[PDB]
Symmetry: C3
Subunit: 324 residues, 3 copies
């Protein structure tokens, strides 16, 4: 920008028929691309950078840009690189990926990749809606989620979870998902056995508090077995030689889930019209000093009217509880 | 050494108009300067090379070539957010997120033909009306949760990302908020224009489960009462009211049935002369206990502390009371 | 004539130093060598050309000129995380996800001034203390779910993303977990310092619905009992305790059987009772109030589908049923 010229000028411009070999340049015009053109970024893996800079990380397989304060970082942000995962008992997921889980075949385990930066993320989704029968297990190795370093199982059908590194203290956390319930942290197999004869109920070495039961590797519905003290009873009957396991588990809640007391449990006597303030919907039940009753059988009630109708002249100071 | 085959410019060179270059192999810094302009190549093809980049003129999406996946939006996926002008049906587009305004009324959205696994559309009830005016989501010939059947959302301030699974199971909700009960409408058993004030209607066949629409607005579940095969409306529907009754197969996702438990004290017998019974596992709610069959509520039957886990009863118990403590942990 | 107007290099060439170029049009393959560095133009201009890309100096964000959107970030959905060190209030920034530690007391976060539709911030309760020291989201004077009022998250392991939809509705939530019921605090119904340990406290006015805070922490819903205008505490709170009660408006976000016989009556000499249709688990049956449980008055096998009562009934007695799962007849 001073004295006389350092390098040869080409005022008209210049055309090339083959690749050139250029020690970099400074564009003061437009970069165009005719058809069939092709453009790459420089590979590069260095912490240090100029902001404005762009690169391809052949480590990360991920397009980064150096940023005034964040340094190097996925370009224009990071979303969900979705990918189906063929069923397989342990799979190691990698950051920035979303996994479509086919547990139709049976249960499977997924291991979170070692965390690098606060906010690293993986996504799992019940592609085929089979996690109720055949749960998924999310292992953070030694890294830990929600405190506990332990594994948790996702037991709910068609559930998706984006796990996100919070740092070391708290570890991975779900930041985003659909249809979450009681995450299950399996505690210890209280009973594992293959069955000789068409058994129905078996005795347990200890009194189970909260368990899940696996029949032939599939997990039974809370409906399929009575529980009592330290005997599990099976409705219906279990076939002969049914590989069956009972597992005690702690429950972690990541989802979000009563009765009405009439005049503080004391009545007035000679009354039968139960005008209720809290306006709700269907209500076919109410209790009376312990024993309860069912509506339109011994209790009339229409939402429109809002009040409730009793039968026998309500006894004075009567424990009156109204459901909804 | 080796006689070269290309002119060399030891101090580099300068140019004052656009050059026309059959590519080069950059070996240095490649900066720009005020009002310089960069443009990625315009490619649609599928054969690429990792670390390559481009502008998709069919997708309007900047894509890089990935070792693994191949040509994808840079940094995986994006919520292109747009308000959607209210219309009967809208076809929608991969990668975009749509804000739906059903204040006007009912409306339906068609999903894009799927190109890749993980193609994703987002929709939001930005206006809190889906309950009042259900959004239908159509997958066309392609299936959403394992069948081609359209599905309708009916939950105020829903919001949900449909992601493409594979030809097989198909479109599924990868993320979202407020997701309640998805409804896949079955045969429309009853549709008619009421000619007079009507409080009840007779149906050809009794309905297992249905949604009721009056003058194009979904009716609140409370408002309609149904018996064997007769729908009863409180209040009575006004005359010249469009009325449609549709059976639907519910599809559940957001909720995560269970809430209580079945325990017993002292095996099922009454020790006698005990007002404070201790529980073995620490529980979040013990709202009431069952004594022989009737129900005894908190601050009326007893009291309890959920760290102690010790129920404290307001009467001196007796022998063979079938004490059975409810687990309101939920 | 048909002459060229610019000099032609059939074999291409070689520079050993930075060249200064009024740009080009590439007809070939653009490539780099180890140590090579590449950058994007700087440009704040609204105007652009589809396929144009840039680094926005004020935005501090690589953008591309989209045909429809215009100059928008490449890859759209870009959630940069970062752990917000706790404070009474904190301004948050478009694009950023905040990990929130209400492990001590509560905290308050001030959603940013919006710019385009789709502007978004994500907040996340990574230590599960919202349930005890909740977060209140302030949208300044921008109006959140239809109103300008602050809302408050009480859900424990909660995550939410907020996403501007234009001023009429305003900030609304488009992704999250356990986003249950937002609380919009109203008038502070009770403000006082506990004189001494007290079992219960009489409200100045009866409360429709409220939240209770003791010594900074929010008392759990179960822990306080409310009857009309009288509130009871099990267990009773300690002496010299700071207590507050606020009426609140709940905003719903996530939104997280029955059977009988003999026409609502019975008959006589009924050993058992054939079920209407084969169903799963059969808990208990209501009879003269005191409902008797299974294996304490009756048995039933799903396959058989029959209420095998373990006795015999008499005259004038009502019976209601309860089952488990969904038999779907």
């Amino acid at each position: 920008m001073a004295n006389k010229p350092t390098q040869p000028l080409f005022p008209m411009g210049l055309e090339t028929s083959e690749s050139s070999n250029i020690k970099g340049f400074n564009n003061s015009g437009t970069m165009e691309h005719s058809p069939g053109a092709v453009m790459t970024f420089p590979e590069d893996t260095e912490v240090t950078g100029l902001p404005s800079s762009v690169r391809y990380n052949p480590d990360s397989d991920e397009f980064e840009g150096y940023y005034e304060n964040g340094g190097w970082l996925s370009l224009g942000g990071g979303g969900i690189r979705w990918e189906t995962l063929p069923h397989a008992p342990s799979s190691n997921l990698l950051e920035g990926r979303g996994y479509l889980i086919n547990n139709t075949t049976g249960t499977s385990t997924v291991v979170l990749p070692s965390p690098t930066r606060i906010g690293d993320s993986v996504t799992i989704c019940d592609a085929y809606g089979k996690f109720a029968t055949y749960p998924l297990t999310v292992s953070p190795s030694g890294n830990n989620m929600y405190g506990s370093t332990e594994d948790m199982a996702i037991t709910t059908d068609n559930v998706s979870a984006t796990f996100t590194w919070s740092g070391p203290e708290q570890g991975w956390v779900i930041t985003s998902g659909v249809g979450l319930g009681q995450g299950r942290v399996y505690s210890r197999e209280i009973f594992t056995q293959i069955l000789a004869s068409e058994t129905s109920a078996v005795t347990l070495n200890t009194p189970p508090t909260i368990v899940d039961v696996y029949a032939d590797g599939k997990r039974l519905a809370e409906s399929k077995y009575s529980l009592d003290g330290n005997v599990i009873t099976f409705s219906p009957s279990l076939p002969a030689s049914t590989e069956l396991q009972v597992i005690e588990y702690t429950p972690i809640q990541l989802g979000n889930g009563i009765t009405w007391v009439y005049n503080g449990g004391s009545a007035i006597g000679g009354e039968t019209e139960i005008t209720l303030d809290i306006v709700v919907d269907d209500v076919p039940a109410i209790d009376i000093n312990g024993s309860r009753q069912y509506k339109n059988l011994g209790f009339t009630f229409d939402p429109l009217t809002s009040k409730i109708t009793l039968a026998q002249e309500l006894d004075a100071e009567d424990e009156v509880v109204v459901i909804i």
